[model samples]
Every structure is written in C-alpha cells, then in structure tokens.
Target chain A: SQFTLYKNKDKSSAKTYPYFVDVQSDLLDNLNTRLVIPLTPIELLCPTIHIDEGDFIMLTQQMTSVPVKILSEPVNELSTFRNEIIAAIDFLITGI
Target chain B: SQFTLYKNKDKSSAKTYPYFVDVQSDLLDNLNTRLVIPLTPIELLCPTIHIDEGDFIMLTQQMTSVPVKILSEPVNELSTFRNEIIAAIDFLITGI
Candidate 1:
C-alpha cells in the first residue's frame, strides 16, 4: 500500500498543475492520457516533490532549459543510445 | 483496480529501459531506490489508462527525447484531467 498510495500520488492545491516551476507557466497544462511530457525520472516517480496549484509541466530538453541536478547518475537521460550499439551489432551480423 | 495496473506500468518489453526513445537510450537503466524526475502534473486522485509488459519509465523535461502526445485535454485521450489542489493544500497547511 505504501508504494501504491503514499508515493504514488502527492499534491497540494487543486489547480491545473501540481508541481509548479517558476518558469513557463502558460504552455504547460493539466496532465491527462493525452499528456505525454519528457521529464526527469524522479519527477515521474515522485510527482509530489513540491505541491503547488494551477501550474503546468513543460516537456523541455533544450540545453538552455532550466538546469536540474542531472548528468551524473548511474544512467543517462535517454535510452536511444542503447539502440545504436544494438544496431551496430545487428548490422555486423547481417553481413550486408 | 483499473488503475492499479493499466497505465501504471504500461509496456511490452522487459528491457531495462522503457519508452525506447531514439536518443541517449544507452544512459538509461533499471530503476530502484532513490530517483527524482520533473513531469506534467495529473493530480493525486485518479488511475488506469494502458497495459503492457515490463519496462522502465524515463522522465525527460528535455527536447529530442520521446514525444508523447500531450498538451491536449479529454478530447482524444484515455484518461483526462481533474483537480484536488484544495485537498492537497488543505492537507499541507493542516498536515498530510
């Protein structure tokens, strides 16, 4: 129940958004099945970091984007790199 | 129970990474313990969307990552948006 309840959902006000960043407040919107945004792993894991109301999340990845504490984890931010290596292996094996 | 599973852990492959973006795919890893990521807010009171196999979820507030369908509303999506920002804030000032 802890994993499903306590950590699963955390929030503050009943605004359009939950975690309110002081950055872009207009483009962001309430999350729905239609909402598929890029985010940090924890942001997705712990959507309840800081509870605010009526804010939206900006799915950004621009270098100029606000910097968060990333780049040093045991993992990188994307999984596409995994494909490159896998593709190399497949190409070499195909012998084309 | 519709949500206890569905979109909660939607996937098809049991790879260490989920979403399978075409970039930085190598940096992602199997998740556990501590993790924090930024994301779009979807309130703290709803559930159920999709279903699948085993895969890890990557959070990206960056560009060039996977572009999931978002920014819309309950028009052409699975689950739409709702709010309890009040319950959350009230709980905060009153304590959760």
Candidate 2:
C-alpha cells in the first residue's frame, strides 16, 4: 500500500498533515518503528503534487500514522522519489 | 568524506543552514544530479547529531552546493542513517 490516503488526516502538526510517506523498505527497528516521517505538500504547489519542478514534499519530523486506504502512488518519477525521500529520512535522523 | 563541515556555510535559506546529505547509491541522472536535498538541524536539538532521539534533520530542496573540504562522518548509527536518509529523499521526491 503506497499512498493510502485518509478519512482522517494525520492530526499531528497542521503543516505535517496529508500523507504517510511509507518507508517500509527501510526495515530497521528504530527506523521503520518509531521515526516514521510523514509527508506533506509545499504552499506554492498546494493542490498539485509533483516533484519535477523543485516542488518537493516536506518530510515532517515527529509525525507518524497508519492510514486506512490507498490514495495514490507517484504517477511519475518513482525512482527519483525513492532516492530523494530516503535522503530526506537520512538527513532527518543524522545530520549528514 | 561523510560530513564535510566547512568554513563556508551554505548561505541559502536561513533555516536550511547546514550539511549535504550525500546519496551516491541511487545513481540516476535526474535522480542524482538536479534533486540534491541538503540537510539541516532542527530547533530543540542543535549541535548534536543523533538519530535515535527523534532529533531529525530537514532536507531542504532546490539546494545545490560544492563543499570545500570533508567535515566528519556519523560517529554512530551509520546503517540507520543510510536507511532513514534514503527514505527521506524518497519522501521529498515522490510524496509517497
């Protein structure tokens, strides 16, 4: 389940809301368990979610959730998303 | 050169004020070159770089820079750093 949307928004931070940037590939205890960074859109590209034109997502820290249904996965640039998203996670966890 | 801290601070946005979360693994052109998400420290935990505490990083987008020299690598939790960082990058790029 990639982008399982919501009947309920992740009511953590107002900005950190919207989607769970599912990081199950990283099967580590501290990783996959506790530090699940959720994803959200930037203000400029509010309604339209795309990563090509510097319109990236905010991997909101201290946020975690389990959504009920799948909204949608990336319609394009799957590999790029994987690369950047993982990079975001690393940067968050370690100051690398 | 894991964490190449510099005499030159990356003078981008005031908040993004820190390191380059280097990701050499997922080698694709658009994936690698253009979309490099630079990392920064969070508010509560400044000057300390650790993953386990939920003291994460902010992967700033549209940021590109060439650092002068190597700084320092992760003193602890390298594998966790890699997994989480890569996950962050993916979330930024794809919104997954």
Candidate 3:
C-alpha cells in the first residue's frame, strides 16, 4: 500500500538508505514491481518527511522500482504523511 | 527544461536506460539536482512517451534526481509530450 515504509534488507545499501516507502498506488498492485523512494538518515539537498522512526530525508531523486518479491512486510506505516510525500514528489516534478 | 531528454553518460547503466528526461520545472533551476526519469529502449510494465528517439518508456516508477553538474546538454526534447508525461506522473501518484 502507498505510504507504507519497509526496511531495506539489502545490507550493502541499507546503511545509507535505511528504509523505502512504497509510493506506487494500490490500484496498480497487479504489477510485479512497486515504485519506491529511499529514505536516508543523513539529510541531503532534497525534501524531508518526518516519522516516528526519525527525521528521514525523502530521496525523491533516488526513486526506483523494486520487485515486490524481495520486499518484506511493512515495518512502519506513514499514511498520515501522505500529503507531505505527495508534496515532495510534486515539488520534484513541478517545483511548486 | 522540462521534457528535455539527456543522454545517459554512465556506460554501465546507459545500455539499460539510454536516456533521461529532465522533469524538474525550470523555476527551480537554482537547485543543484534535477528530477529525472529514465527512458528505456526495452519496454517494461510502465507508462511510456514517444519522441524522435523512438517509443521510450517513461519509467515513471524509476524517477530520480541527478546532479545538474554531471548532466550533459540535452540530446533530445519532448516538450510536445508534456501532457503525456504529466498524465503518467499523475497516474503514478493519484491513479486517476
């Protein structure tokens, strides 16, 4: 589901990108891969979306599609932060 | 500018994603990075937009931001496909 945060099980990139948000719309669940944006502990020159885990930066620029088979169950959910996430994505494309 | 395509200089990834479209609005030109979506020669399960280069998949799910410094000059432009690009992004988020 959208706004659900999943742990980055891949050890190599997990140190920097600790989490990933499933941004793909639920309507497209039939697809094999889900579009995701990585969350980083260290802030970069990008937008940030806060959650109980911590102040994680939304690496909108690093957004990519990942196979659903590799994704684990949702460790944390941020449905409340939907607007913020959408805003960040909107800003990325429209610069609004 | 938005809809302008740039050749992917990274040799390794270039074979898969040969081109990238700068979707970031020109208003945020001051930013160090620009939001971009890779264009693939091989069509996958994603939305696509056509240009002189051929039928290139937008890969909206794989959208990311790249440093402006490393990006080369525009190799192709798709300003005319603005609506299609925006619609793909809109569908990715809103599923409308």
Candidate 4:
C-alpha cells in the first residue's frame, strides 16, 4: 500500500490538502493507523512530485499517522515515483 | 553526524527532554537546521533504545528539525544502534 494516494475525506482540510500518500509498509497491514504525507500546493521547501493533477509538494515535515477508517480506496498509486518518495523521506530525516 | 546524541541547550525543556539524537546525514553539515528525534523517558509507544543514561523512547513520531544553535556538542553517539535507529525511522515512515 506504500505510495498509494488517497483523497482526503476530511472536509475541513480537503481544500488545502486534497490528497495524501500512504507511505506505510505493507508488513504493518494490521495496524489501525497508516503513516501518510500530505500533498499540498505550498512552496517547494521540500521535495516536489508531479502527477496528472499537477505538481504538488510532499510535506514530509507534516507527515503523520492517520486512522484507516478515514481513508478511502486507492485513488492513485505513485509507485513510479517510489525513488523520489523514499529520497524525499531520506532527505527529511537524513538531510542529504 | 548521524546517530549522535546532543544535549538540549534549551533550558525551558531540558529537564524533560535532555537529549536529542541527530538523525540527519553527514552530507548536510552546512545546513543551519538538523533533523533530530527527542529522547524521552515517556511511554514506549515506539521503538526504545538503551544507552548509558537509561532506556529512552525514540519519539520518532515527534521528529522535527531544530536550529543547530540549540544543540550542544555530541554527548554520545549511538552509532552502535545505527540499525535500530534507522529501523525505527523506517518503521515510522514505512511501517515495516
């Protein structure tokens, strides 16, 4: 399920953060919460990935775990940008 | 500089969080901010690492970037627990 994009079901923040990318590994499939990075139209302070919806910055700093019940089925998968995603995370954690 | 533990120079929260582990890669040595995970005597909700000070929770979920000025010299280096530190971060992001 890693790299899969899901639409934000929360109406409050849906306008600014419309989608979230599930970065949780498949091994923890039983967990109630999944770690995700919010996609935003904010500044390019961090890694930016381009999708059909246009380019959105991956807010690695704001990444957090969310309940699985709030997330809908996979709206899109960014397996193609797997390297970039991992690198973005690495950059955030490792600052390389 | 990865896996190095630095004393929290901030006095306001030093009693509760005395140390922070620098998880940023060595490549970003020039940056003004470093990504760090606070070591706390809190609940073991996440991965725990034992050092001379005692076993402290890695607080991976609260990992954030802080100004380098607030950190003191390396108090200790947990390079020995490199695998565990990286694993904890991986588990946080990837849930593996």
Candidate 5:
C-alpha cells in the first residue's frame, strides 16, 4: 500500500523538516553537521529524513510542506518482514 | 556461519519424524489445533535464533513437535534464555 508521511510542522516551535532542508538549507551553513541514529542500514543512505530538533515531517519543496502519517504494509514473506527470531523459526520448519 | 548441529537423531520412544506423516498429510483428522505468538524481544536479538517448534515454517511447529522445536529457538542471551518461563522465573535465570 502507499504510505502517508507525517511531521511536527508547528512553526512556532523549533522543529526542522525534510524538504525544508533542501529548500532553506542553503541558508544554514552547517547543514551537513546534523546527527541521527539509523533505524536500519538502508535508512542511513539517501534519506531527506532528519531529526531536526525532533520533529518528523516530509519535505515537498521546503516552505511548502504537508504533514501526514507514513503507514506502510509491505507485501513480503514473513521471513522478510518478521523479526529475525521469527524468521529463524520459519527457516527451521520445526518447533521447541 | 557454520553453527554446530545440535540435536539427537534418536529413533525410539514415541517421537517420530522424517516428516513421519506424508509430505502431504491426509491421515490425521486434526491437522490444525496449534497457536503461537511473535515478539520483538527487548534485548533484540536475531529471530533466526529462536525456540524451534513446528511452525508455518519450522518455528511455529509445536508439540508433539513442540519440545524439539524449543531447541531451534536460539535465545542464547545473557538474560532471557537462562530461565525457563514454563517452570519458574523469580527464583533463577536472567541477568545478575
């Protein structure tokens, strides 16, 4: 299914955004110096996603952004989507 | 990973498999009466190393395939694996 993304875009608070970076980021000299922990290896590379003061939003074109929840239902084998433990169990085709 | 093989290949007593039933069982009147739950352990280890029970794969497979399945669940944790929940928790095994 398609995913809907969300963000904390209340401008009164000190929150940053994904597309905002691409838009106004030319304005911040230290844009490359942001920090974030990876949820998985794939997330580490090529994500406009950032933890700018801890707000979650997707950037469309900087100042003009939308807020939505990114819910996903990937169609994959339980082996692909399940926790490693469950996948392990699936692999063996046996029980304890 | 060349993990060591860890179980008995015994042939006596009551336990039997080699899929003891037909590859496609049409013998047992009750082929489905089993249930199990999945979890993401707080310690967060690989799911591959889970208690092996006959499952949709091998993991969900349970008794009479049950005890054998337990071994497949590789909980080798410094905490959770040490105690047997079906027996008692407060008295032994977990982290110290």
Candidate 6:
C-alpha cells in the first residue's frame, strides 16, 4: 500500500485543481477500491504542478478523503515518481 | 469488464507512444491489477489527441494485452470516456 495522489473529481477544487491525495496503502490488494483523501498545494489551502512529469501536489493540509473507484490498479502508477510524492507527504505530515 | 488505456512503461515506445489498451472486463473485481495492451494511431503503425480530454487511443490493429498492476480501480476512470474508448475498440474489433 502507498499514499497516492490523483486529479480531483470536483473540478472546483481546481484552486488546488487536479490534485487529490490517498492515505490508503496499496499493500492490501484485496480491495477493489481505495479511499483517497484530497490534497492541494501549500498555496491552494496555502497551490501546483505541470505536465509529463505529471507535477507534484503539496499533500500537507486540506487532508480530505474520498472513496475513489479504481480498476484494482492505477491508470498511471506514481511508483517511479514515488520519491517526489513521498517527499511531499513527508513534508505535509512531518514537515521534514 | 471494460477497455481502458494507459501510458506505456516503455518510453522508447514514445513515438506512437503513451497509449496502451486493456481488453479485460471489470466484471471481476477480484484482482488488484488489470492487463493493459498498447495502442497508437493507424498513423503510428498510422498516429493523435492532446491533454485534459486525456485523448482517445485507436483500439484497432495493435490489439495487444499485458498484465498491469492496479489499485483496484483506475488512476482515473474512463467510464465517462467509455463511449469514446468503446467506440475506438468497436472500430478496431468490428470495423464499424
């Protein structure tokens, strides 16, 4: 299991536009879905990222969780870029 | 079961790049991953679409499938885009 980010379903959250964070771990492959908590930039509640690199979201505050339906996997896996996501989460949770 | 597309893990495939197709159905939510096959334009093989729309992958000819690890859902669901995805698969399989 891992903490992942996704584009928000609520487009209005676009102030944090396109960024949602998941607190659930991918370890339990048993469930066919995940509970993803929403996250925005330090700028949004506090904001942002661009394409290809897929950008990074500040996952510190605005911690909100929502049930996001998945295909048992991710349309795009952020594992390769996990370092970036983890770093952001670290800063958010630990302020490291 | 449903057909979905994902960005390919192989960056070298970037020419007709960024598209993979899955022929599996969503009927079984038992697995934590899905098999995704690759797809490109009739131009790349024959070529394309841009962002936000997430674009549509040509499901004809390049019909292939690979086991993809998922989080039980999709990084993003294409159901809203299902009509488009289905149409592409339809054209690919049935030549409608």
Best by DockQ: 3
lDDT of 5 by residue, A1-96 (tens): 112122223443322322122111112213222111112111221122223223323211111211222212221222222233222222222222
Clashing pairs in 3: A61-B64, A61-B65
lDDT: which is higher, 1 or 4?
4
Residue-by-residue lDDT tens digits, candidate 4, A1-96: 788998889888877888888887787757787778889875433577778766788876566667787688998878898888888778776666
Measured over all alpha carbons after superposition, the RMSD of each candidate to the real structure, in angstroms, is: 19.3, 12.0, 2.7, 4.5, 20.9, 18.0
Worst 10 residues of 3 chain B by lDDT: B42-51
Q: Runs in model 6 with CA error above 4 Å?
A: A1-96, B1-5, B21-23, B29-50, B53-59, B69-75
- Assess candidate 5 and give its lDDT: 0.22
Worst 10 residues of 5 chain B by lDDT: B87-96
lDDT of 6 by residue, A1-96 (tens): 444445565555555545554444444323443434344443341134443425555433333324344212333444554556545433432235
Instruction: Report residue B89 deviation for candidate 1 (angstroms).
Output: 21
Q: Name the candidate, 3 or 5, with the larger TM-score value.
A: 3
lDDT of 5 by residue, B34-79 (tens): 1111222223211232443332112111112212332333322212
What candidate 3 gets wrong by more than 4 Å, as runs, is A42-50, B42-49
Using TM-score, give the best candidate's number: 3
DockQ of each: 0.04, 0.04, 0.56, 0.30, 0.01, 0.01
lDDT of 4 by residue, B54-80 (tens): 778887655666788989998887899
Q: What share of the true interface contacts does each candidate keep?
A: 0.04, 0.00, 0.62, 0.40, 0.00, 0.00
Clashing pairs in 4: A25-B94, A94-B25
What's the residue-level lDDT of A8 in candidate 1?
Answer: 10
Per-candidate clashes come to 33, 34, 2, 2, 42, 36
Candidate 4's TM-score: 0.64
Scanning candidate 5 chain A in windows of ten residues, the lowest lDDT window is A33-42
TM-score, each model? 0.16, 0.30, 0.84, 0.64, 0.15, 0.33
What is the per-candidate TM-score for chain B?
A: 0.16, 0.42, 0.86, 0.89, 0.19, 0.50
lDDT of 1 by residue, A1-96 (tens): 000101112232212222212121212312211112222233231121212212223322211112232111222222322233224322221221
**Count of clashing pairs, candidate 5:** 42
Worst lDDT run of 10 residues, candidate 1 chain A, spans: A1-10
